[PDB]
Every structure is written in C-alpha cells, then in structure tokens.
Amino acid sequence: TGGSSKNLGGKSPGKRFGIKKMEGHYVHAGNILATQRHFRWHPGAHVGLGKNKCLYALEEGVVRYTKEVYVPNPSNSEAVDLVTRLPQGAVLYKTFVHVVPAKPEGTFKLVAML
RNA sequence: ACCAAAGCUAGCUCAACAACAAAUACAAAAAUACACCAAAAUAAAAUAAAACAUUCACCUAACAUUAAAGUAUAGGAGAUAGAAAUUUUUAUCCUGACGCUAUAGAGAUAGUACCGUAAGGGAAAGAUGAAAGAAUAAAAGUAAAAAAAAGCAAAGAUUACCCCUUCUACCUUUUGCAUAAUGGUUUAACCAGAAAAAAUCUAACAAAGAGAACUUUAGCUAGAUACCCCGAAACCAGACGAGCUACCCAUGAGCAGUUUAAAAGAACCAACUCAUCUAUGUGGCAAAAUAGUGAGAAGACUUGUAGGUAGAGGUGAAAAGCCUAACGAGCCUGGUGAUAGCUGGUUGUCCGAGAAAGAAUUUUAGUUCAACCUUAAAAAUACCCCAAAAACCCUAAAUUCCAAUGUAUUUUUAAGAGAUAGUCUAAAAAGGUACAGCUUUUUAGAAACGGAUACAACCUUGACUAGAGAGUAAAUCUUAAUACUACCAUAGUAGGCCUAAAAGCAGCCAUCAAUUGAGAAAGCGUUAAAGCUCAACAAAUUCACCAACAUAAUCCCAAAAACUAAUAACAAACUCCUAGCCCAAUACCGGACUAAUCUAUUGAAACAUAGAAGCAAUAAUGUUAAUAUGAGUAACAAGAAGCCUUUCUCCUCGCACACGCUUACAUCAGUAACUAAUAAUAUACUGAUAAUUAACAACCAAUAAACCAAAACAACACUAAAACGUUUAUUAA
RNA sequence: UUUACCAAAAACAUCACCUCUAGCAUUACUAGUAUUAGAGGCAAUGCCUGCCCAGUGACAAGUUUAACGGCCGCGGUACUGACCGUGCAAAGGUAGCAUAAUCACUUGUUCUCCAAAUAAGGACUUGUAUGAAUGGCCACACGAGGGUUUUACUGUCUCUUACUUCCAAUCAGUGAAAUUAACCUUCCCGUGAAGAGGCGGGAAUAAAAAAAUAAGACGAGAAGACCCUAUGGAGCUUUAAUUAACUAUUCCAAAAGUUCUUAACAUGGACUAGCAAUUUCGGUUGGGGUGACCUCGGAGUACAAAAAACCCUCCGAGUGAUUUUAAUCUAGACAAACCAGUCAAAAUAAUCACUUAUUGAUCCAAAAUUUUGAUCAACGGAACAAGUUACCCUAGGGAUAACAGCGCAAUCCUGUUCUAGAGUUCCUAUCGACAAUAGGGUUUACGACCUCGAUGUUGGAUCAGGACACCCAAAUGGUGCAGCCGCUAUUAAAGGUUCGUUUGUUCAACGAUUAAAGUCCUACGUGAUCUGAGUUCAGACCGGAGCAAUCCAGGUCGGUUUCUAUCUAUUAUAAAUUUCUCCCAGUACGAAAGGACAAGAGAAAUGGGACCAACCUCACAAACGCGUCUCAGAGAUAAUUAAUGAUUUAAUCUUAACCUAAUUAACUCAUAAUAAAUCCAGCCCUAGAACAGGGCACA
Ligand SMILES: [Mg+2]
Ligand SMILES: [Mg+2]
Ligand SMILES: [Mg+2]
Ligand SMILES: [Mg+2]
Ligand SMILES: [Mg+2]
Ligand SMILES: [Mg+2]
Ligand SMILES: [Mg+2]
Ligand SMILES: [Mg+2]
Ligand SMILES: [Mg+2]
Ligand SMILES: [Mg+2]
Ligand SMILES: [Mg+2]
Ligand SMILES: [Mg+2]
Ligand SMILES: [Mg+2]
Ligand SMILES: [Mg+2]
Ligand SMILES: [Mg+2]
Ligand SMILES: [Mg+2]
Ligand SMILES: [Mg+2]
Ligand SMILES: [Mg+2]
Ligand SMILES: [Mg+2]
Ligand SMILES: [Mg+2]
Ligand SMILES: [Mg+2]
Ligand SMILES: [Mg+2]
Ligand SMILES: [Mg+2]
Ligand SMILES: [Mg+2]
Ligand SMILES: [Mg+2]
Ligand SMILES: [Mg+2]
Ligand SMILES: [Mg+2]
Ligand SMILES: [Mg+2]
Ligand SMILES: [Mg+2]
Ligand SMILES: [Mg+2]
Ligand SMILES: [Mg+2]
Ligand SMILES: [Mg+2]
Ligand SMILES: [Mg+2]
Ligand SMILES: [Mg+2]
Ligand SMILES: [Mg+2]
Ligand SMILES: [Mg+2]
Ligand SMILES: [Mg+2]
Ligand SMILES: [Mg+2]
Ligand SMILES: [Mg+2]
Ligand SMILES: [Mg+2]
Ligand SMILES: [Mg+2]
Ligand SMILES: [Mg+2]
Ligand SMILES: [Mg+2]
Ligand SMILES: [Mg+2]
Ligand SMILES: [Mg+2]
Ligand SMILES: [Mg+2]
Ligand SMILES: [Mg+2]
Ligand SMILES: [Mg+2]
Ligand SMILES: [Mg+2]
Ligand SMILES: [Mg+2]
Ligand SMILES: [Mg+2]
Ligand SMILES: [Mg+2]
Ligand SMILES: [Mg+2]
Ligand SMILES: [Mg+2]
Ligand SMILES: [Mg+2]
Ligand SMILES: [Mg+2]
Ligand SMILES: [Mg+2]
Ligand SMILES: [Mg+2]
Ligand SMILES: [Mg+2]
Ligand SMILES: [Mg+2]
Ligand SMILES: [Mg+2]
Ligand SMILES: [Mg+2]
Ligand SMILES: [Mg+2]
Ligand SMILES: [Mg+2]
Ligand SMILES: [Mg+2]
Ligand SMILES: [Mg+2]
Ligand SMILES: [Mg+2]
Ligand SMILES: [Mg+2]
Ligand SMILES: [Mg+2]
Ligand SMILES: [Mg+2]
Ligand SMILES: [Mg+2]
Ligand SMILES: [Mg+2]
Ligand SMILES: [Mg+2]
Ligand SMILES: [Mg+2]
Ligand SMILES: [Mg+2]
Ligand SMILES: [Mg+2]
Ligand SMILES: [Mg+2]
Ligand SMILES: [Mg+2]
Ligand SMILES: [Mg+2]
Ligand SMILES: [Mg+2]
Ligand SMILES: [Mg+2]
Ligand SMILES: [Mg+2]
Ligand SMILES: [Mg+2]
Ligand SMILES: [Mg+2]
Ligand SMILES: [Mg+2]
Ligand SMILES: [Mg+2]
Ligand SMILES: [Mg+2]
Ligand SMILES: [Mg+2]
Ligand SMILES: [Mg+2]
Ligand SMILES: [Mg+2]
Ligand SMILES: [Mg+2]
Ligand SMILES: [Mg+2]
Ligand SMILES: [Mg+2]
Ligand SMILES: [Mg+2]
Ligand SMILES: [Mg+2]
Ligand SMILES: [Mg+2]
Ligand SMILES: [Mg+2]
Ligand SMILES: [Mg+2]
Ligand SMILES: [Mg+2]
Ligand SMILES: [Mg+2]
Ligand SMILES: [Mg+2]
Ligand SMILES: [Mg+2]
Ligand SMILES: [Mg+2]
Ligand SMILES: [Mg+2]
Ligand SMILES: [Mg+2]
Ligand SMILES: [Mg+2]
Ligand SMILES: [Mg+2]
Ligand SMILES: [Mg+2]
Ligand SMILES: [Mg+2]
Ligand SMILES: [Mg+2]
Ligand SMILES: [Mg+2]
Ligand SMILES: [Mg+2]
Ligand SMILES: [Mg+2]
Ligand SMILES: [Mg+2]
Ligand SMILES: [Mg+2]
Ligand SMILES: [Mg+2]
Ligand SMILES: [Mg+2]
Ligand SMILES: [Mg+2]
Ligand SMILES: [Mg+2]
Ligand SMILES: [Mg+2]
Ligand SMILES: [Mg+2]
Secondary structure: OOOOOOOOOOOOOOOOOEEOOOOOOEEOOOOEEEEOOOOOEEEOOOEEEOOOOEEEEOOOEEEEEEEEEOOOOOOOHHHHHHHHHOOOOOOOEEEEEEEEEOOOOOOOOOOOOO
C-alpha cells in the first residue's frame, strides 16, 4: 500500500529562547539577560538591546523585573496608531528588565602629597 | 576384586664457540651401437584504508651497534611510509640454562605404518630388579550388593533409610528462559589478556638529572602497574592430475538366429549396450544397488590396449554438463596465526563502589564524543528551598529561580572504561479500530527468599553472620434479584364539514350542553353501522410501582462453612532482643589475601621472606586416550544321512588366455587366543619346509627399386573408398 | 545425444534451406583451393516467408532485416461500419491459425462425448499480450514424451480371504549405529518466554520383565538451501565507473632509399574495435521489495523556564527588492558532544519581503596580493563504481517475514433491547430500516510475543477425541396450524450423518439415493502410519517485461518422503439404534381435492458379540465371507401439560407448602459374565510369540 505522508520538514531544533537570568541575580557587564524572538520583555534601565532582540546587562548589578507604562517611539508608526485608537482612559503596559548598579562609580585615592 | 594407576629415561629445545664391489636417468638400480644438445621474460594477492579503485611496512639485499629521528621529507597530503650529512662501539678468552620430561619437548622409536593415481598428507607407542645364566589397590565403568506408592532428587531434620515440609538443573543469550532457546554421556590430560606515550605509586639525586648524544619554570632517572582463544565462503602464485569421465589420434576386436532382392541410421528377438516405470533398500549387499519391467541391438553401434588437450584452462549432439565417490569452476603446498562490526568460549577465594541511552556517522548488529559512573586529588558550599519575580486573547496538574532551615553533599583537577538493540505499571498525549502482551515521545515507579494460589514489571519491605526468641507489614476474598383486584355503563346526537359511506374512533373544525353521575372520546372493532372495554358516580378498601439479558471445543476445578464475643490471631530481608569478624547485585573499575611450580638465601618431612612465570577449567557440536548408554538389541552363517568321504536331495557365470595382483598357491604340523563377521576345520589364521624346468610367450636388420586396382565363402560389385608385403639389387658379426 | 548420483523431455543435434567471412602452401584448416573451407541461424518434405533502413549494430553519407528489433490513433456517420475527418509514424500485423503447452477475465459460448465431465475432441473467435527462418500453417512415418475415449482383462477397488518362503519370536555363537545435563521419567485444568513428566490447585499410584502400537518428549539426523542483515563472497550480463596485456586495425615517427616510396621482420607514441581486467551496487523503514522521504525555518503535538519522538498534523526555503555601502580591535556572555552557530560595552577611526530559512568541512585546484570554486540535495560531504542470480556460497538472526500458536476483534459470527415499517386491517405467525447493549474466537487482516545449531508446510487415505450455535432420530410451545405438508421457537449430544462424473483441489456444479446425507475445533487433528496430484529448488517451452543476464501469488510437461522406539501414553466385559412394510381406517379432518399420529403384528438394514451343518474361498484335520445365529427390564429427570391451593380468603401448575400427577436422551442399577490357594518332569491340544492355560484313569 502506498504510504505517502505528504508533510515535510517538521524538524528543527529548538532555539532555546527564554529567560537566562532571574530576578535578583547578580550580573556582570555584558551578560545576556534574556533572548526572545518577539518582544516579550523590553530593555529597561542599563539593559541594552541586541539586533536579534537579545537583552544584555550594561552595568554590574542586580537584575529586576517591572511592569511599566509604554510610550512608543513617534518614529515607529504601527505602535503610534495602536496608541492612538485606545479609549481615552487607558494606558499601555509592558514588562521590562533592569540592572541595579552595585559597585560605586569610582573612588578618590591620594596619589602624592607635595 | 576386575579394568586400571604410578615411576625416569629415550631424546629434544634455545644459545655460545667453531663397509666396499656391481648396478643405476630402457618402464632408475638392465655391461654393450649413430648423436644431438640445451633454454630464458618485475613476484602477486589475501589484507590495512572500517567500502574501494592511487597508495598498504616485513617479505632481496645486506649490514651491523649507540645517536641524529620517528626529524627532513613522501603520501586519495588520508591510511600510513621514512632517510642522510654527521657521531658512538677493546682484545680474545669464560660456557651454559629461574629450557622440556613420553598428550610435553622435534612430526619423529619414522618421513616409517597407513591414506592419496599423483603433487601431497602423515600417526601411535617405552617403564620390575644388582642379577629373570634369580619369579599403590586411590579416575570414570563395573562387580561384591536388582527393585517397592511421591516427583531437578536435595535440604530441614528426626529414634528411624523412606514416609512429612520447603524449594521452577547449570551455562550462554536476552527486555524477559524451568522453558518446548543454544551447549554438554562421564573420567583424565591438555586448552584462551601479551605492549609502558601520558599518568598514578615507591625510591635516587636536585636547579638540575641521567655510565655520551637527551629533557629541564621541580625536574629528571629507575622500578612497578596494560590491552585474549577457535571458526568461513574467498583471493593470489607455483606444482600435480585425462588409469574416472568429455572429445579426439593410433592400433585391435565383437554382432547369433528370424524376416526381407537388402547390413536399409528397415522389422522381430538373444549376447552386448543403455536406464523407462514400479516395489524393495535408505549406517543398504551397494557413498546410486537388487527384482520384475522396459528402450536400442550392422550402426551418429558397443568395447580392449596405448597416446594427446590442464584450471585466467581443457572438452562440450549446451545439461553453466564432465575433468578421480562435494566443479557457477579441480586438487595440493605456499602466501597463512588471510579477514570476520558475526556466533561460540575465556579457568582461585573474599571484600568497596556501581551503570538504561543526548549527538553525528554506508549509521541504526558498530564506533567516537556528551551526560551518568569508578579510582585517586584539591577545594567550597551543595541539595532542600517563604515572600519577590518569568507575555502578549483562553488556558489544568505544575515548572524555573532563591534566603531561612534540615542535613552532608557537591564542584573542580588527573586517570579510566563499559554502555549507547530495554520491558511493563500509573499519568499527559499522539497513531490505530476512544484493538492489541501495539507503536511514538514527556514525568514517576519497579524488577522479595514476604503477599497477589502459580507470577518480571502491581503491593509490603530494603538489605550483613549466628539464636529451638520477640513485635509488627502487605495480605487470605466477600456484594445481590418478585402479583394485579372491583363494579358498572342512558341522554341532544349517527355536533357540523367533508365523504362510497365518515356515526367517539379517515381527516379538518368545534368542544357545547340532560341527568347525580357519565370525553362531542383513550383503547380495539365495523364497509359504515353493530359491538366490546377505559375514563363518571355509586360500593369500598391501599401494599406497591421505576423490575430482569444464550453458548465452545481432553475432564467440574481446594474441601467446606451462617455464630461461643475481633480494633482479634497468624503472617517477612522490615524492627526490637543476646552475641559478632557488623549490611544485595549483572558490564566496567578499585582493594586484600592465597593453590601449584621454579630461582635466590633460610628450611630440613611437610618450609618463609623475596624474585619470576607455559601461574589454577563444571561449559568452545573443544582436541587426544579411555570408558559407559542405546544393547547382549540390529545383524550375520553350515542341504541330509552314514562306515567318514560314501551315497543321496536340489541349483546352474564353466575351463583357458590377456591385463592386474604378488606367495595369499604345495606338503607336514599347531590352533587356548588372534583371520572367517559365528562353529566345526583351514584355499584365506601361525611355524617349518619345499615350488612354476621351453618347442608356447617376450626380446629379436637396414637402404634402393618395381607394384592405380578393397575386406565382405569373393565370381564380381557397392560407396563411406578400405588394416595388414612379396620379389629383384647392395651390405648384414 | 544429455543433467555419472532427484529431470530422457516438447530440450540439443540432424537431412534440408538460407546469412555472413575468406583468392591462398609446409605441423592445424590442408599435402586442401569458392560445387571448397571456416563462423552461425532455423530444422526434413509440402504450401509459404508480408510491410519496415527512423534507432542500435555491422559493413565498406549510402547500403542492409533468412541482423538486433518494430509493425497505431481519436472521434463522425448505411446494431454495426464499406465510407469520412484530422493526427502522429520508419512502417502501421498480412497469409494463416486461434480460449492455445499463449497474462488476466476464465469453469468464454455452444455441439458431440457420459446417468452425470472445470477433462477430451469440433466449431465460433479482436489474440487487444497470436503470427510467418527468434519461422506460420497443414500431412504421412516414428516416440519408454504428454493428454482423452472404447474393447478385453483382472484383488486396483465393493471387501477382504487361504496358504507357502524370507524376515519373525524362543534356544546356542559372535556383536554394531545415530543418540544421551542429570533423572527417583503420571493424568487433568489453570499459569507461564504466550502449547508443562517438573510451577499452582486437584487427582491417581506395590515392584520389576517380555511382546505390540506410534499420540507426545516442540523426538533423532544436518550451526534453515526460504526470508532478512554483514559497508562478507562468488558466477553471469551490459549504456555501471575506471582501463592494460593480447589479437587485429589505421596513423605518425624510427629504419632503409629516393628525389615522394615500404619486401618481410620490428621498436616508440597515438587511434578504432574485439576478446578481456579491477571494483561496487547508499540508508530509514511497524520484515524486505515497490511507493515515499534524507539538509534548513515557522506553527501545533510539547497548554506556564529550557529540552523533547514518529512513514505525526499543517505552511515555507535552496532568494529577491534597495541604497545608506552596512568598518577595525577587544571586556563579558548565550548556545553547544565536537564542528559549526550567536549577541556585544568600552577603545580607535543596513532595510523590506510573517525575516526567522536562503545555505556546504577539510584536502585539491585555479587565481592576485587578497581571494573565488559543488543538486558534494544520500545536504558532517568516499577524487571517480550499475543490473541480475530459482546455479548459488559463508557468517549470523526468531533482534525480522512465510506455517502454526498467542494477543486484539476492524471485518466475520451468535443473542437479546427499540418499534418505524412490511404482513389487505393487525408492530413482534413470519420478518424489521435508523439505532442500543452483551458475548464467540474459524475467516481476511493487524501486532511481531516462542521457535531460523529446522515447531517438515495444501488436499486425500486410515483412525477418530470433543463442542452444540441439532442435519436426522426423541418430547413439546406458536402459527397468517382444518388434515397433509410446512414455517418458526424451547429442551435433548448415547447413536448416526451415502455412493458417483469433472477438477490436485477443500469449496462448487451435476447424476442417483437416503431418517438425514449438520456447522465447527482439535498445530487449517492425524506424513518417526501412508500418499505428493498440488505448491516449492535444479531441465524446458509459450505469452509478456527488459539491450541483456534473468524475471511475472501467469500457464504448461518433468522431478529422491530417511529413522532399528530409550521415556511417557496405550493394547477387548455385557445390559441395542434405525428404517420400510402390514394393518387401523381411505377412516378422524375438510365444500370437496387430498388425506394423520397412537396402539398392535411383520420384515429388513446397520452396529455390538459369536460360529462352520450346508454354500462359497478351500491340494491340512482348519481358517474364512459372499454364509449362519443372537440382541433386554426397572428407576430417574429437561422443556412443557394438568389437579388441590395460600401471600391477595376471586383467582392462580408453586424461586409457597403437603401429597402430587403426565412425559426424551443420557445416567444409574437390577440382572448377566469371571470367581475351587500351591503336583506339575515329560508328552499331546480347537490354548499359545516366550512364559501362562486345558488334557494325559478308562478306551
Ligand atoms: Mg517544531
Ligand atoms: Mg528535534
Ligand atoms: Mg579494506
Ligand atoms: Mg576491521
Ligand atoms: Mg567488501
Ligand atoms: Mg604487498
Ligand atoms: Mg611426542
Ligand atoms: Mg600406494
Ligand atoms: Mg572406582
Ligand atoms: Mg518425597
Ligand atoms: Mg521464571
Ligand atoms: Mg552455551
Ligand atoms: Mg527474544
Ligand atoms: Mg516456551
Ligand atoms: Mg531450536
Ligand atoms: Mg540461537
Ligand atoms: Mg544436545
Ligand atoms: Mg612512561
Ligand atoms: Mg613530582
Ligand atoms: Mg581485490
Ligand atoms: Mg574484498
Ligand atoms: Mg593420456
Ligand atoms: Mg584416456
Ligand atoms: Mg544379425
Ligand atoms: Mg534397425
Ligand atoms: Mg512381479
Ligand atoms: Mg526391441
Ligand atoms: Mg523400433
Ligand atoms: Mg556426446
Ligand atoms: Mg539452456
Ligand atoms: Mg540454467
Ligand atoms: Mg571429486
Ligand atoms: Mg581471527
Ligand atoms: Mg558518508
Ligand atoms: Mg554493524
Ligand atoms: Mg540556593
Ligand atoms: Mg528491538
Ligand atoms: Mg547499537
Ligand atoms: Mg491481559
Ligand atoms: Mg524512567
Ligand atoms: Mg510464593
Ligand atoms: Mg536489617
Ligand atoms: Mg351507537
Ligand atoms: Mg357533565
Ligand atoms: Mg513473625
Ligand atoms: Mg555492594
Ligand atoms: Mg594455562
Ligand atoms: Mg578437568
Ligand atoms: Mg549433535
Ligand atoms: Mg568439554
Ligand atoms: Mg553395552
Ligand atoms: Mg529395543
Ligand atoms: Mg533378528
Ligand atoms: Mg546355507
Ligand atoms: Mg599374467
Ligand atoms: Mg574366530
Ligand atoms: Mg548418459
Ligand atoms: Mg539424473
Ligand atoms: Mg532418471
Ligand atoms: Mg529443436
Ligand atoms: Mg557465398
Ligand atoms: Mg518447416
Ligand atoms: Mg519476415
Ligand atoms: Mg487477421
Ligand atoms: Mg490465457
Ligand atoms: Mg505479438
Ligand atoms: Mg528475427
Ligand atoms: Mg514470438
Ligand atoms: Mg520418414
Ligand atoms: Mg527416440
Ligand atoms: Mg505415444
Ligand atoms: Mg541370541
Ligand atoms: Mg515413576
Ligand atoms: Mg496466559
Ligand atoms: Mg497447559
Ligand atoms: Mg524385538
Ligand atoms: Mg511416538
Ligand atoms: Mg522436558
Ligand atoms: Mg512435532
Ligand atoms: Mg543459522
Ligand atoms: Mg548481501
Ligand atoms: Mg562488499
Ligand atoms: Mg589492485
Ligand atoms: Mg539498497
Ligand atoms: Mg536496509
Ligand atoms: Mg514495509
Ligand atoms: Mg510488522
Ligand atoms: Mg524506491
Ligand atoms: Mg562603541
Ligand atoms: Mg570543489
Ligand atoms: Mg550520508
Ligand atoms: Mg547525514
Ligand atoms: Mg546538524
Ligand atoms: Mg529454470
Ligand atoms: Mg548458511
Ligand atoms: Mg520475535
Ligand atoms: Mg504446523
Ligand atoms: Mg502468523
Ligand atoms: Mg508454538
Ligand atoms: Mg470480544
Ligand atoms: Mg487487531
Ligand atoms: Mg517491540
Ligand atoms: Mg525456524
Ligand atoms: Mg535443538
Ligand atoms: Mg467422532
Ligand atoms: Mg440447544
Ligand atoms: Mg456425535
Ligand atoms: Mg494439518
Ligand atoms: Mg497433510
Ligand atoms: Mg507426527
Ligand atoms: Mg519467451
Ligand atoms: Mg516420466
Ligand atoms: Mg508439475
Ligand atoms: Mg515416510
Ligand atoms: Mg517396549
Ligand atoms: Mg516400527
Ligand atoms: Mg451382525
Ligand atoms: Mg382458592
Ligand atoms: Mg385452578
Ligand atoms: Mg452392575
Ligand atoms: Mg495343567
């Protein structure tokens, strides 16, 4: 009996998208925080956005997650319109990641007393 | 008590040093007549490359030894292969043995018996003593000594052998084996893990270490720790084979009768040749037969002796036939311990810890990485883990991540393997038939010697060794199902409407109104009527209603049971108790001891410290020897009587030669045991002695020349055109 | 003439007929010379041999089929199509013959042949897959070829029998073989790696010999010839991929001479062929083949961190479109077996197309100053290799098929529950759509769980064990049952359940009968009892498919069936069944036409048990059938009919009493067999394999 199943190429590995660090994790500058294919979490304070929508930590610190108000860039039109048609009482919210800096910025050392 | 058992020698390993005489290549072993001689062309493949085409060390040569160096180079630049320049080396003498004892060591008492036509293969065995010029009772198997209901053959035990009670042979192989999967009759003797790069361990000397060349940021140098056995079909080179069979070339030989003018690939039918059909036979009488029955039988006929063609070939009236009792390609010896991701085997004891499949792959019967894990080391946190936190429409069980806290685990570093062919149970889903002892993933569990009788996965429990102590755990199998009863029945009016009729009761409309009470009717009934009951009083009594489901093939499947009181009792490897040497296991990996040899010193009767190894067989359809079982079974043979070679009774491959065998033949003697498949006695066993006598048969000249004229009862012919010598001359001991 | 040893044939050869290739001398052919000699085809004779040079050949562009090989559509029209249109071809299958030793349908149609024929012969005949030297068609004569009829003959058979001889069993000699874990070696039903002498629950059971029979020990023999798998082999064939030697060819050099030639040898490099070499023939797969797929990404499966399978369900990619040319160097990271993949601060000075996928490692090649090279798509990639094997071989596997078992029950098979409907009226006498719920385990499948160091597989023969979902016989309910037949339903397994023609056949048709000529299971019972016609190896044709080798669950002809029994098992008690007659009574029953049971007498037949006076077989005094004899009481109940009679004062056979009654098969048992303990040497026997048993006083 002809057993042809017409479907092809279901097979891909998973991309291991997801959250790499968790709230209250210590982080060094450069660590990737989470990696996603669509924006699930947006970059907050001290979190840089990679061209593939990676989130990495800019400072040395503690990673925090947050629900905050979303005010799209006036250059990006779709989001501008989505913001436009809302009923007059409602604001948009999203989830952000943050780094909270640990090390102080610097120190004043006494080099020489002349 | 038989059968058996034991010796220590014959000789071997490895290494230093350095009886002529005759006869013979005629068909070897034969004194002697005319010739010829003599010759040479790369090694290939098996195998590595996980296939296979280029390529694959060693295999011929010498060159040795310490180095340069596994370096320069050469390679489907893969596998692997691999120099030189230049360097080093003191003499002989000084022989032996941590080499084997008769399944070893030579194959050897022998290249012999024997097996092959031939090249070639190739065994087995000996044991007393000074003297034979003296005559231990320990393997299996059996005997002494048949066997008495029952059941992996034992164990717990008992006064007692049984009788009771408790237990699925062992290996290998698998997901899982009592399996009705493989292996083995039993005994003995043989019969299977080898390497030192990196590492660890123990020592030397140390900024150096090594008895030369090298390596060095604690290193070097030395020791010690390591990696099997048996199997193809094949492929390549060189020999040997045509005494079988295939086909040829020589030289011979058969074919009677009967029929026909006939030797005409004609008839009939013997000898002779084939092999049709059936039955016997099947470890046979026979590695292809016998009995009957059949085909051909002067021809493409059968058959004897002697040549020839040889495997990359020959031969073939093609059957891929035949070429020496296996031919899709002979046999033998080499290559050759060919190569097997594939079976099958792999030998002492006792302890520690212990594994289930993520990737790639001519890969899915295999490897190599990760993860888990084992053995050492260094460290610091590891599991558990409350808020807090992880997405956008709907979205359960739950994950991820972390302090406290309960515990001791986890990570790194250095070495290593196996494993990577899983099963079921619960849960979430797919596919299929909302089927599988079905298949495919994800999360858990399990693989008791206790329960579910029996039992791999379910349930109770985790583990040692003794006790003729205790407490408990899971669990023994129960549960049910019934009835319907009075008495009575007139009215408009067969209401309209339809319709053959239509009268409650074919369908539409209406649902009215007498009686105290009876529907313009819920059933059947009739063509329509007619007729039966239900609803309505009257008389009474009232208690219910939610009903159930045939069978399989050897022979039903503990026996039984309503009851003396139960939060019983009885029940494990669990847990107490009394003592300890103090807690399971396949692959793989760590440790501690020791059996038997030999060598160093001890030891003296069995030895104890070391060093060494041919270092330990219950399993390979293992090898050899010997024993059983089947089994005293299958099967084998001699015509009668006498006075002992004389008569009888029956059936018919007989005497010579050729080839081939070699004393098997003849006489006398002996036969306990060897040969005869048994006896008697002897042509076939043993000893001694003899024997076949040449006129038959073998051996036995050349060169010239004449000669066209078949055998066939041979007159003469036929087509297919036929084997064979006389005579003359020249010389011939 | 052939497969010495499974096939003597239709296979091969062969007279004859045709194609090719050759013009010549010392070893073949050949001491030959084209009427000859070599390669072949096809098979006498007779009548024939159609059309086709486009492919591949082969020859010396052209030529060739008695070379390899081919020889059609589509529709329109007088049920058909002589005609018609248009298309493609190198030509369009003709003369014959025909259901065939010719794919299937298919047991074609019909006649003859028989009581009956899937056989045989004759016809028709599109054979859509005949067909003319890979020969087509008739015909003598011949086949140990295949098929069919008749005569005749008979032990083939109805349906067996007697007697001899070899074996045979007892005595005496001699004395093997495969095989064997150990066995102190039962039966049943369960269980279990799915078929138990060993497990569980029950049964049964002094001990050993000899003789028999073959159900079991997945019996004994051969490390399965089937199947699949090894990066195992080999033989065969070509368009597989790489290509020598050789034999021939053609050419250029060389060599000799000429001013362009080659006599025979003969070397270097080519070419073109023949013969010929070396090596392979990927993988997944609910066995393999055929089919399909092999890398890369989005969804689902996989619901909320990651991961996550299938020959799972669905969509995509092997690049475009631009402009703005999207740079160096280095912290920290994700991911990850490895290889590859990803983000990215500081320091110096690409976008849109769901956007995610648009891609290939080393080595080796070309390039310039630096870099580009693949349906390597089997996508972690061998620098370059296909077909076959039924002539096959080895290593393995029950890791995986075919047989059988087991699981499951889609399909199949028996019931019930529900009434629409049929049945004129009437659901359920006889049935019954759409549907519900239980069962059975034989079918075709599906799984791959035991077996590949063998569990030998279809149909018969013989002998049967069992189920009951009764085909007969036996009791009964209902009827759209007057009676006779019937049609349905309930209870009953002791006994039965035929002989033929055609097929290998179970099935099926058909002839003739029977009381009936059941449906099943038992390894589709039964091959250490038998038979192999069939499937299923080697030979061979004929369609077809391939260029071939070979091949098609397509036909046809032919073709080895081995075991001496160790163990378990087993090796004779009886106590009938069925017809058909004759009667009754031509009566009961119906308007008549047709027409019964029950009771009672007879005959047979079959099955048990025996026996020879006759007959028949008989050369023994016996054995034997074709001949003769003899065959049973009582008790029980199943389904169903009735009486008294309560719960419930009527009723009511009652899963209420008490007695009851009527009625099958089994199954019991009356009755029958056997049944005196020990002398046994001999010798007789109607008794016997041995041992046992009966006789041996007359007479
Ligand atoms: Mg996906
Ligand atoms: Mg995946
Ligand atoms: Mg190789
Ligand atoms: Mg190998
Ligand atoms: Mg190979
Ligand atoms: Mg070599
Ligand atoms: Mg020796
Ligand atoms: Mg000899
Ligand atoms: Mg003994
Ligand atoms: Mg016992
Ligand atoms: Mg078991
Ligand atoms: Mg074994
Ligand atoms: Mg298995
Ligand atoms: Mg079994
Ligand atoms: Mg077996
Ligand atoms: Mg096996
Ligand atoms: Mg055996
Ligand atoms: Mg070392
Ligand atoms: Mg050190
Ligand atoms: Mg080779
Ligand atoms: Mg090879
Ligand atoms: Mg010869
Ligand atoms: Mg000869
Ligand atoms: Mg004659
Ligand atoms: Mg003749
Ligand atoms: Mg005869
Ligand atoms: Mg004859
Ligand atoms: Mg004849
Ligand atoms: Mg011949
Ligand atoms: Mg042939
Ligand atoms: Mg053949
Ligand atoms: Mg031979
Ligand atoms: Mg080997
Ligand atoms: Mg590959
Ligand atoms: Mg493999
Ligand atoms: Mg923590
Ligand atoms: Mg498997
Ligand atoms: Mg594997
Ligand atoms: Mg079950
Ligand atoms: Mg698990
Ligand atoms: Mg138990
Ligand atoms: Mg304990
Ligand atoms: Mg009225
Ligand atoms: Mg009223
Ligand atoms: Mg206890
Ligand atoms: Mg342990
Ligand atoms: Mg040893
Ligand atoms: Mg031993
Ligand atoms: Mg054997
Ligand atoms: Mg052994
Ligand atoms: Mg014996
Ligand atoms: Mg016997
Ligand atoms: Mg005998
Ligand atoms: Mg005799
Ligand atoms: Mg002689
Ligand atoms: Mg003798
Ligand atoms: Mg012959
Ligand atoms: Mg033969
Ligand atoms: Mg024959
Ligand atoms: Mg012929
Ligand atoms: Mg000619
Ligand atoms: Mg002809
Ligand atoms: Mg023609
Ligand atoms: Mg025609
Ligand atoms: Mg046909
Ligand atoms: Mg044709
Ligand atoms: Mg032709
Ligand atoms: Mg033809
Ligand atoms: Mg003739
Ligand atoms: Mg003939
Ligand atoms: Mg004939
Ligand atoms: Mg005897
Ligand atoms: Mg017994
Ligand atoms: Mg079972
Ligand atoms: Mg059983
Ligand atoms: Mg006997
Ligand atoms: Mg038997
Ligand atoms: Mg057994
Ligand atoms: Mg059997
Ligand atoms: Mg095998
Ligand atoms: Mg193969
Ligand atoms: Mg191969
Ligand atoms: Mg080669
Ligand atoms: Mg393939
Ligand atoms: Mg495959
Ligand atoms: Mg398949
Ligand atoms: Mg399957
Ligand atoms: Mg395919
Ligand atoms: Mg920057
Ligand atoms: Mg390239
Ligand atoms: Mg591949
Ligand atoms: Mg791949
Ligand atoms: Mg990949
Ligand atoms: Mg054939
Ligand atoms: Mg084999
Ligand atoms: Mg299996
Ligand atoms: Mg079977
Ligand atoms: Mg099956
Ligand atoms: Mg079975
Ligand atoms: Mg069922
Ligand atoms: Mg099924
Ligand atoms: Mg499976
Ligand atoms: Mg098998
Ligand atoms: Mg066996
Ligand atoms: Mg029967
Ligand atoms: Mg019944
Ligand atoms: Mg019966
Ligand atoms: Mg059968
Ligand atoms: Mg059979
Ligand atoms: Mg049998
Ligand atoms: Mg053909
Ligand atoms: Mg025949
Ligand atoms: Mg046949
Ligand atoms: Mg037989
Ligand atoms: Mg016996
Ligand atoms: Mg027998
Ligand atoms: Mg009788
Ligand atoms: Mg009453
Ligand atoms: Mg009454
Ligand atoms: Mg009795
Ligand atoms: Mg007596």
